[PDB]
Amino acid sequence: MVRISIAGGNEIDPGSMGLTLFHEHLRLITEVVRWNWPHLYNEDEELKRAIDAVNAAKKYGVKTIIDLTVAGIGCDVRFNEKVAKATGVNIIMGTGFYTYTEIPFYFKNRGIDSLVDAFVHDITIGIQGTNTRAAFVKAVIDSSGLTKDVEMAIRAAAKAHIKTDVPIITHSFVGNKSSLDLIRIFKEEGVDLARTVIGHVGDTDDISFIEQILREGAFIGLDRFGLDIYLPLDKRVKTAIELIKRGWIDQLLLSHDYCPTIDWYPPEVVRSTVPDWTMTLIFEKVIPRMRSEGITEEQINRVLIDNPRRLFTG
Amino acid sequence: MVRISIAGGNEIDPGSMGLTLFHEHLRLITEVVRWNWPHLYNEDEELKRAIDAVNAAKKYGVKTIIDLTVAGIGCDVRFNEKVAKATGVNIIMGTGFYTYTEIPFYFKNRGIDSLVDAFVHDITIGIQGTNTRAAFVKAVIDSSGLTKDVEMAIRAAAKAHIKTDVPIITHSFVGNKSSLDLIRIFKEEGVDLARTVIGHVGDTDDISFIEQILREGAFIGLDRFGLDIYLPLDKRVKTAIELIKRGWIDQLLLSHDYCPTIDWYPPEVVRSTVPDWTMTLIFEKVIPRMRSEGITEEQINRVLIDNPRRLFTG
Ligand SMILES: CCCCCCCCCCCCCC(=O)O
Ligand SMILES: CCCCCCCCCCCCCC(=O)O
Ligand SMILES: [Co+2]
Ligand SMILES: [Co+2]
Ligand SMILES: [Co+2]
Ligand SMILES: [Co+2]
């Protein structure tokens, strides 16, 4: 019976997560830039935008949000504690190393075990000197594919899972075979695929490619609703309805991947280009369209409540 | 007439730097690792090792140390303020972005001007929310050569120099042509080479390669005395004596590049492999050997006092 730490250092367990967004962000920032140039940032605005987004989701029933911000994209327990105390929403945190190409010389010179030990420390003792412990581990691969450093960080995630039993939630890229690289590696390391999510699969509507992942037994992340560049909304909704009609409902997870702040781009170019991206679009637009095509209220609850719960049990 | 900020936010000017080590470190750490895994570090040990090293240099007459730790290797004004208040040694700080391959998506998505503006802010207003201002700018290239991101960061350093007139102190690699890449770029941007240091040239004893840099008019960094892997001590000393006998004394700068902490390696492997590396070796070993081969006390003073002073004037 698993105990899930939440920001603030209380615990809950899989059965009490309730209605959950399994992949979102509160603040996505680049550590080396914020450390060195704090004049480029405004902590009061960042906190306000995050509290606003999380309160909007809370209005539609969200009890638990899983924050996918790990090392390399600005993981910050203390910032998350403030969001949690202001909103009353449970925030689940994780560990891992986010990169598409390289890892730090710190870990290249010491090897895979030093990275595994850092993740195992966050999972068993606490993130960043706190008693909030990581409840999952992340692995990342994108359009550069499987570089050596990427392969190391993915295998480290797999090994931390093997030691601690926390699930693995991933980031992949549908424009190459990266999702299948993740599957191969996890199988080489003995990971039970039912404890993993292959991420960002919602970015494609190619049913045959999706089913080739689903046949391995993993969950899939239909997890960027609202980011149309990628795959427009109408195709994302259509794909989710079709996968449910074809029998796959127990392997589906939904989310928006919302970033109330993301430092990678100026904010104006993001607001102009994906103006519908929020942490509530699944409630305002996706779920009504699914219901009006015959998806049941219970089927929605299975996806948004049971599937996350089951990811975190077994 | 130039004002040089020092850690703590006092100012001095080139004439009062006095006996100077132009390239050293107080603490070299990886921001993303220390931000995310503070359990791997001990701030009290790091501070003590830095205060100890700086007091040892102070015993031999050092008044001013230039800290070459910039963004990407853990630049931290507040840590440096503590070292300064404890030791009474002037600490000069800089700006730039340290990398051998990639720069953050933050700057790739906004372009070279956003990096120039970050450096110009540190030089004219202050580093990290303080009134300690950067007094030089750094540019870096190593064994991967001139990647696109590296080229951007080098040109940004050149442009910040063109706006603000602070000197440029560089890191290069003698095993390829990187030193000459720096020279070409600085010339394309209109930089006066007498306001630059081509770094880590002391890692070679090939007189003909060194003179090809000296002929361009830049200073050179004979700046890793004590790191024998690279080029043993006896050859480094011999090269400095020969360059002075061949007429080059006004273009020579000496230092140890000492890191009281460096997170890239476990400490034991560093202590075992370069056991003589300290912030005092130039005083205990190099200068006596130079004097006993006929280098004058005034020639030593020209190198350790006038050359840094002149780097910072014009
Ligand atoms: C092309 C300029 C504006 C495009 C806006 C796209 C916003 C980028 C979304 C960030 C991708 C999600 C991050 C991640 O979770 O891995
Ligand atoms: C090969 C294992 C131990 C080797 C010890 C070498 C210590 C590395 C020195 C760091 C290089 C200077 C950093 C820099 O200033 O750019
Ligand atoms: Co992602
Ligand atoms: Co994400
Ligand atoms: Co260097
Ligand atoms: Co250095």
Numbering used by the authors:
A (entry chain A), B (entry chain A): 1 to 314
Q: What do the study's own words say?
A:
VmoLac (YP_004245953) is a recently identified enzyme that was isolated from the hyperthermophilic crenarchaeon Vulcanisaeta moutnovskia strain 768-2833. The phylogenetic tree that was built from this sequence alignment, indicates that VmoLac belongs to the clade of the PLLs-A. Kinetic characterization indicates that VmoLac is a proficient lactonase with promiscuous, poor esterase and phosphotriesterase activities. As expected, VmoLac is roughly globular and exhibits a (β/α)8 barrel topology that is similar to that of others PLLs such as SsoPox17, SisLac8, DrOPH3, GsP10 and GkL36.
The dimer can be reconstructed by symmetry, and the observation of the other neighboring molecules reveals another, weaker interaction within the crystal packing. Intriguingly, this contact mode between the two protein molecules connects the two active sites hydrophobic channels. Therefore, this density was attributed to the simplest fatty acid that fit the observed density and that was present in the expression host E. coli: myristic acid. The carboxylate of the fatty acid molecule is tightly bound to the bi-metallic active site (2.2 Åα–2.3 Åβ), while the long aliphatic fatty chain that sits in the hydrophobic channel is mainly formed by loop 8 residues.
